[PDB]
Amino acid sequence: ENLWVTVYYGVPVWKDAETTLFCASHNVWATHACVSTDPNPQEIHLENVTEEFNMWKNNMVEQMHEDIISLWDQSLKPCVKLTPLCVGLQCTNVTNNITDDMRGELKNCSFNATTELRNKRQKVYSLFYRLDIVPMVDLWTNYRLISCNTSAITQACPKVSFEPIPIHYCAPAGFAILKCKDKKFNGTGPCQNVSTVQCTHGIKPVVSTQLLLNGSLAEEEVIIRSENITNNAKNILVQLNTSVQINCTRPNNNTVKSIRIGPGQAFYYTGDIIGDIRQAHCNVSKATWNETLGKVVKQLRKHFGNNTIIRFAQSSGGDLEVTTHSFNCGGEFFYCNTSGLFNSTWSITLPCRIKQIINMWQRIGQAMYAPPIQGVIRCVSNITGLILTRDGGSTTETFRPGGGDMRDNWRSELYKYKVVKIEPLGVAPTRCKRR
Amino acid sequence: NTSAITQACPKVSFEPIPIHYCAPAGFAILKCKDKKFNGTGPCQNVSTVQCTH
Amino acid sequence: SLGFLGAAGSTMGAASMTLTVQARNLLSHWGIKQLQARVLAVEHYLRDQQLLGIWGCSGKLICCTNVPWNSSWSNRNLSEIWDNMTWLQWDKEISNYTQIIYGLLEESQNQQEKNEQDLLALD
Amino acid sequence: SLGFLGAAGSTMGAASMTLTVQARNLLSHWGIKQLQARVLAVEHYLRDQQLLGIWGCSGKLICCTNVPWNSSWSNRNLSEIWDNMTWLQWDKEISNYTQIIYGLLEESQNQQEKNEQDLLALD
Amino acid sequence: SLGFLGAAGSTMGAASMTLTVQARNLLSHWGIKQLQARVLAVEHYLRDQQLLGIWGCSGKLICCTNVPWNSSWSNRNLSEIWDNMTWLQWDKEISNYTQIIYGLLEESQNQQEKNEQDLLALD
Numbered sequence: 028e029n030l031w032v033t034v035y036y037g038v039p040v041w042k043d044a045e046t047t048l049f050c051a052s053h054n055v056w057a058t059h060a061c062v063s064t065d066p067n068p069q070e071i072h073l074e075n076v077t078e079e080f081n082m083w084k085n086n087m088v089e090q091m092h093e094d095i096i097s098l099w100d101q102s103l104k105p106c107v108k109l110t111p112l113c114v115g116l117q118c119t120n121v122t123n124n125i126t127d128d129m130r131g132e133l134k135n136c137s138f139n140a141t142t143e144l145r146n147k148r149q150k151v152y153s154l155f156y157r158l159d160i161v162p163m164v165d166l167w168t169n170y171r172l173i174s175c176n177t178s179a180i181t182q183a184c185p186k187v188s189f190e191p192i193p194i195h196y197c198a199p200a201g202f203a204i205l206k207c208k209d210k211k212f213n214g215t216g217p218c219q220n221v222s223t224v225q226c227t228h229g230i231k232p233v234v235s236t237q238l239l240l241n242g243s244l245a246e247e248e249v250i251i252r253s254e255n256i257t258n259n260a261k262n263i264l265v266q267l268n269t270s271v272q273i274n275c276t277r278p279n280n281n282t283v284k285s286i287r288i289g290p291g292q293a294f295y296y297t298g299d300i301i302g303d304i305r306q307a308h309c310n311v312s313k314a315t316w317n318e319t320l321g322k323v324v325k326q327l328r329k330h331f332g333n334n335t336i337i338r339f340a341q342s343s344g345g346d347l348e349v350t351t352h353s354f355n356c357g358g359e360f361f362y363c364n365t366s367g368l369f370n371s372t373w374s375i376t377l378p379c380r381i382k383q384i385i386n387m388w389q390r391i392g393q394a395m396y397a398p399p400i401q402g403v404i405r406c407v408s409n410i411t412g413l414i415l416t417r418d419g420g421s422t423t424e425t426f427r428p429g430g431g432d433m434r435d436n437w438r439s440e441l442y443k444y445k446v447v448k449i450e451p452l453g454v455a456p457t458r459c460k461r462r
Numbered sequence: 463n464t465s466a467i468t469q470a471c472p473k474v475s476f477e478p479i480p481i482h483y484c485a486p487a488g489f490a491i492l493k494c495k496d497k498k499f500n501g502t503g504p505c506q507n508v509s510t511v512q513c514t515h
Numbered sequence: 516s517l518g519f520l521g522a523a524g525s526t527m528g529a530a531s532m533t534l535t536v537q538a539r540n541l542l543s544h545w546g547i548k549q550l551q552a553r554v555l556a557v558e559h560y561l562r563d564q565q566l567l568g569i570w571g572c573s574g575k576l577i578c579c580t581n582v583p584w585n586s587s588w589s590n591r592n593l594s595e596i597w598d599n600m601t602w603l604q605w606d607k608e609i610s611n612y613t614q615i616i617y618g619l620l621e622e623s624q625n626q627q628e629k630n631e632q633d634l635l636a637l638d
Numbered sequence: 639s640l641g642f643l644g645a646a647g648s649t650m651g652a653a654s655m656t657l658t659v660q661a662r663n664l665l666s667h668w669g670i671k672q673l674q675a676r677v678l679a680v681e682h683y684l685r686d687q688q689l690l691g692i693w694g695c696s697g698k699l700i701c702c703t704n705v706p707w708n709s710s711w712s713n714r715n716l717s718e719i720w721d722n723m724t725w726l727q728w729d730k731e732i733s734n735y736t737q738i739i740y741g742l743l744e745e746s747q748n749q750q751e752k753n754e755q756d757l758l759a760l761d
Numbered sequence: 762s763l764g765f766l767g768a769a770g771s772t773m774g775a776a777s778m779t780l781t782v783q784a785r786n787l788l789s790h791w792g793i794k795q796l797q798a799r800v801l802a803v804e805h806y807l808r809d810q811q812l813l814g815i816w817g818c819s820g821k822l823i824c825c826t827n828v829p830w831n832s833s834w835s836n837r838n839l840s841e842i843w844d845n846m847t848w849l850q851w852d853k854e855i856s857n858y859t860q861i862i863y864g865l866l867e868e869s870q871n872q873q874e875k876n877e878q879d880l881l882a883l884d
């Protein structure tokens with residue numbers, strides 16, 4: 028046909044790409060780091076566009092992970108270090124009324140701390156959780172802080188909230204984010220109801236293990252997502268289509284006192300407890316949870332067999348940070364025992380521990396001291412998904428709560444988004460020639 | 463009692479040095495040359511500079 | 516009227532009428548990540564504009580050239596390419612030949628500029 | 639001749655002869671502030687050059703188009719506008735219609751560019 | 762063909778066939794240093810493109826104007842400039858006169874734009 032090459036600029040095509048995204052949105056996150064969000068939800072549906080997604084090869088997860096860790100470290104860096112408190116403690120039993128489940132959990136410790144002046148010392152009394160102290164043999168002491176033998180303990184800055192707030196990860200111009208608006212989306216493979224957005228809906232950096240809190244719900248049915256469901260070494264992300272409300276509390280009324288440990292420094296500690304001492308706990312409605320697991324096994328049988336028995340069991344062992352359900356509540360860190368939720372074959376109260384000196388990730392060499400919060404803490408949150416691991420062990424599959432790899436927490440979200448690079452240039456044969 | 467005390471470096475002077483503020487390209491700084499200008503309202507003369515005095 | 520990339524699933528013919536809809540969307544310590552992203556957006560825009568300049572297509576969105584289609588890059592007729600195909604499918608179909616086509620376009624302009632210069636040298 | 643904005647107070651018909659004077663002055667940790675200032679200046683420049691490209695005015699300072707002037711945008715006669723008014727007063731007067739005009743300019747080029755392609759497709 | 766600067770030692774005529782080879786290689790604390798390098802490269806590119814646009818040479822690598830050559834700048838004939846001479850030697854000779862030529866190019870294009878506007882205003 029005597030066709031000629033015609034060059035078109037502004038062609039609606041793209042290629043998969045990895046680029047640097049920026050965030051948009053008294054707090055760890057979105058202090059000054061993030062750009063004010065454009066309030067207009069400029070979402071464009073792409074009719075007849077099928078896009079292949081892979082939530083386990085999504086570089087937005089790696090960027091979200093690095094951004095959260097970086098912001099966490101930036102928040103804690105300009106704060107009071109507790110190296111002057113790495114001294115032996117004289118600890119005795121708490122003299123208040125202790126319930127059966129709190130015997131030895133909390134101890135009344137005393138120590139000689141520094142003051143505003145280098146040449147002075149003060150005797151300080153405080154209540155520490157057993158998890159935060161370890162035995163030591165010394166002259167006039169019994170225990171020392173658990174992290175002083177590993178790394179410096181940094182006190183979190185007071186009045187800087189750890190509450191997760193939605194963060195929007197937005198693409199630079201020349202790039203676009205595609206969303207998969209597909210009900211019951213597998214999390215991998217072609218997605219027909221693709222749409223283009225400038226950026227995400229606002230993802231809360233909620234940190235938890237085993238149970239996914241304050242996330243997004245499935246549009247119609249529970250969705251089982253796994254990189255390779257056959258391989259038991261992979262974690263399974265279960266997105267629920269209904270929330271399960273979990274009510275977590277620390278009923279003790281804490282009286283919080285503070286001391287100076289140097290010029291301009293301050294250390295916060297629990298001074299005493301008002302009322303009886305009770306164990307922290309979470310209440311999960313029994314009927315709702317039973318229906319939730321019924322739905323989960325109903326979905327699992329599609330991959331494991333219509334006639335297979337599915338069993339749930341508690342975690343297999345290891346560090347508290349991964350064997351229990353870790354979460355932030357009111358600024359406090361709860362480590363709840365989930366064996367009451369995953370103990371079955373196909374009101375529930377879960378006891379919880381509180382730990383003030385924590386390692387936020389698997390990395391070793393850093394530690395943070397979470398200051399106590401005055402009063403009584405009660406949180407109401409939605410369980411929106413589960414992290415499950417399949418037992419290696421033949422029939423009757425056994426599932427357990429998963430771990431704390433964090434990427435799983437940031438794959439429950441960001442599984443429907445892909446970043447693509449726009450390629451405005453293209454060529455095509457036309458009948459048009461110069462002159 | 464409340465603040466950290468940092469000693470100023472003995473080699474760094476506190477003497478004020480004239481600072482010129484300069485606009486980036488695409489912007490300009492307008493200077494009001496109206497004598498007895500009270501700091502607000504229309505300035506009859508005006509001139510364009512890239513950097514302040 | 517469909518917005519940025521709204522024509523992505525439409526045929527090449529229909530999509531060719533929305534070039535300006537998305538062309539405007541190519542330009543528009545934590546400071547470094549955002550600043551680098553802005554610089555990269557600028558570098559990609561400028562590389563595409565420079566490439567259009569090399570081909571003699573500066574300032575145009577639909578630029579006709581003097582390079583013939585050789586029927587080996589793709590042997591589809593215009594009816595199938597423009598009425599029964601999208602730009603994503605076309606881009607995939609001739610991806611392996613884009614560097615060849617771009618090279619020919621550069622060579623074509625190099626000859627054309629000399630020809631214009633020679634025509635302009637006649638009195 | 640008069641300076642960077644020397645013609646700013648002159649009438650439109652006089653200031654229109656100094657367009658190169660203003661055009662040449664649009665391009666030219668503390669490093670972050672300086673880089674943001676330079677990147678922003680570049681981004682604004684490119685936004686304007688891209689917009690001129692969309693309208694078919696790339697490479698020109700005075701670009702004539704095929705969009706008719708609407709008497710509802712400004713009902714002043716041509717002599718009044720060019721002989722007795724400055725560009726600042728005009729910019730204020732036409733501010734509420736600038737985006738309307740820009741939209742029409744884009745539409746005009748989109749039609750013209752397709753028409754040029756069809757004229758070029760005649761053997 | 763000869764590489765990025767392969768024609769650097771060739772005569773001015775021969776090196777005029779490689780303008781795309783050099784043109785396509787102009788665009789492509791550690792973060793601050795990398796950003797300053799990228800921004801500076803972009804600003805140099807844009808200043809040169811703006812300058813070509815001011816002269817009416819936007820989108821071209823070889824551009825012919827209406828400014829006559831003054832023998833006071835160089836009185837060598839074409840057989841001494843386009844042959845038997847390289848671009849480096851020429852740049853060394855046309856140093857003190859570069860700003861004069863650029864000023865004349867700007868004025869010539871300003872007159873060209875006004876003349877085109879008047880011709881296009883004739884019904």
Ligand SMILES: *[C@@H]1O[C@H](CO)[C@@H](O[C@@H]2O[C@H](CO)[C@@H](O[C@@H]3O[C@H](CO[C@H]4O[C@H](CO)[C@@H](O)[C@H](O)[C@@H]4O)[C@@H](O)[C@H](O[C@H]4O[C@H](CO)[C@@H](O)[C@H](O)[C@@H]4O)[C@@H]3O)[C@H](O)[C@H]2NC(C)=O)[C@H](O)[C@H]1NC(C)=O
Pocket residue numbers: 186187188189190191233240241354355356357358405406407408409
């Ligand atoms: C999942 O999401 C839910 C919310 O959807 C989270 O629950 C919220 O958690 C935040 C933070 O813990 C709660 O905010 C706190 O509320 C306290 C009580 O607020 C009452 O009183 C005030 C009076 O002004 C009313 O405005 C308000 O509506 C309530 O009636 C406040 O006292 C807290 O402020 C104190 O602590 C913060 C610490 O950051 C300091 O900055 C303040 O200065 C002050 O000392 C704080 O505002 C919020 O109320 C909870 N919501 C609900 C509905 O209960 C879950 O925690 C979240 N889950 C996970 C795992 O992230």
Ligand SMILES: *[C@@H]1O[C@H](CO)[C@@H](O[C@@H]2O[C@H](CO)[C@@H](O)[C@H](O)[C@H]2NC(C)=O)[C@H](O)[C@H]1NC(C)=O
Pocket residue numbers: 120121122123135136152299300
């Ligand atoms: C932790 O131990 C300290 C030291 O014994 C207790 O503080 C004393 O408590 C008695 C009452 O039992 C007071 O009369 C003293 O004046 C307190 N001394 C100081 C230095 O505070 C403290 O009450 C104990 N706390 C708990 C919860 O058992």
Ligand SMILES: *[C@@H]1O[C@H](CO)[C@@H](O[C@@H]2O[C@H](CO)[C@@H](O)[C@H](O)[C@H]2NC(C)=O)[C@H](O)[C@H]1NC(C)=O
Pocket residue numbers: 341350351364365366
């Ligand atoms: C969570 O609670 C369960 C039940 O109290 C604990 O399971 C017990 O673990 C011990 C470990 O030595 C076993 O001897 C018991 O037989 C288990 N009990 C039951 C009923 O099976 C579990 O260890 C607790 N986990 C955490 C992390 O605290």
Ligand SMILES: *[C@@H]1O[C@H](CO)[C@@H](O[C@@H]2O[C@H](CO)[C@@H](O)[C@H](O)[C@H]2NC(C)=O)[C@H](O)[C@H]1NC(C)=O
Pocket residue numbers: 644645647648649652
């Ligand atoms: C500023 O306004 C003055 C007038 O107030 C301009 O100067 C003269 O104005 C008269 C008006 O009839 C003209 O005929 C003269 O030709 C103007 N003088 C010159 C030298 O052109 C003055 O030009 C205006 N300034 C600017 C920068 O435009």
Ligand SMILES: *[C@@H]1O[C@H](CO)[C@@H](O)[C@H](O)[C@H]1NC(C)=O
Pocket residue numbers: 120130131
């Ligand atoms: C403290 O409580 C623990 C609980 O197991 C008990 O074994 C211990 O003897 C108690 N010590 C004192 C001094 O009361």
Ligand SMILES: *[C@@H]1O[C@H](CO)[C@@H](O)[C@H](O)[C@H]1NC(C)=O
Pocket residue numbers: 161176177
């Ligand atoms: C002290 O640190 C070492 C090295 O990290 C560790 O092996 C040891 O268990 C720690 N001490 C206690 C009492 O846990």
Ligand SMILES: *[C@@H]1O[C@H](CO)[C@@H](O)[C@H](O)[C@H]1NC(C)=O
Pocket residue numbers: 241242270407408409
């Ligand atoms: C929990 O789910 C309900 C569903 O209606 C919703 O209204 C509520 O806001 C959710 N709560 C949280 C904390 O996400």
Ligand SMILES: *[C@@H]1O[C@H](CO)[C@@H](O)[C@H](O)[C@H]1NC(C)=O
Pocket residue numbers: 213215216251252253255256330
């Ligand atoms: C969907 O997910 C399952 C596991 O949930 C996986 O085996 C399968 O390969 C995925 N892809 C498709 C197209 O079904």
Ligand SMILES: *[C@@H]1O[C@H](CO)[C@@H](O)[C@H](O)[C@H]1NC(C)=O
Pocket residue numbers: 255256257258
């Ligand atoms: C999943 O893991 C099993 C382990 O035996 C392996 O054989 C299979 O090929 C894996 N599948 C995928 C899709 O990676």
Ligand SMILES: *[C@@H]1O[C@H](CO)[C@@H](O)[C@H](O)[C@H]1NC(C)=O
Pocket residue numbers: 274275276308309310374376
């Ligand atoms: C949990 O349930 C128990 C049932 O006895 C109740 O006493 C307790 O107050 C509940 N706690 C919360 C936080 O809902």
Ligand SMILES: *[C@@H]1O[C@H](CO)[C@@H](O)[C@H](O)[C@H]1NC(C)=O
Pocket residue numbers: 317318321371372
């Ligand atoms: C409640 O849990 C038991 C566990 O054995 C199960 O048999 C029963 O069907 C469940 N009931 C529901 C989901 O209504």
Ligand SMILES: *[C@@H]1O[C@H](CO)[C@@H](O)[C@H](O)[C@H]1NC(C)=O
Pocket residue numbers: 341366367370371
């Ligand atoms: C699991 O449930 C059975 C009763 O069905 C109970 O005997 C057993 O102790 C429970 N295990 C855990 C770990 O809660």
Ligand SMILES: *[C@@H]1O[C@H](CO)[C@@H](O)[C@H](O)[C@H]1NC(C)=O
Pocket residue numbers: 280281301402403
């Ligand atoms: C704790 O006790 C103090 C005693 O003064 C009281 O003021 C405070 O309100 C109590 N807080 C709670 C949460 O019960």
Ligand SMILES: *[C@@H]1O[C@H](CO)[C@@H](O)[C@H](O)[C@H]1NC(C)=O
Pocket residue numbers: 073074075521522524525526
């Ligand atoms: C999608 O395909 C249908 C097929 O009938 C067509 O009518 C529609 O216009 C297409 N969508 C777009 C955005 O081109």
Ligand SMILES: *[C@@H]1O[C@H](CO)[C@@H](O)[C@H](O)[C@H]1NC(C)=O
Pocket residue numbers: 591592594595
């Ligand atoms: C284009 O080619 C297809 C076969 O590939 C044929 O069916 C169709 O009729 C052809 N159309 C024209 C207009 O030649």
Ligand SMILES: *[C@@H]1O[C@H](CO)[C@@H](O)[C@H](O)[C@H]1NC(C)=O
Pocket residue numbers: 706707708709710
């Ligand atoms: C001018 O604007 C008015 C607005 O009502 C419109 O009706 C009219 O058609 C426009 N005329 C032209 C020539 O654009």
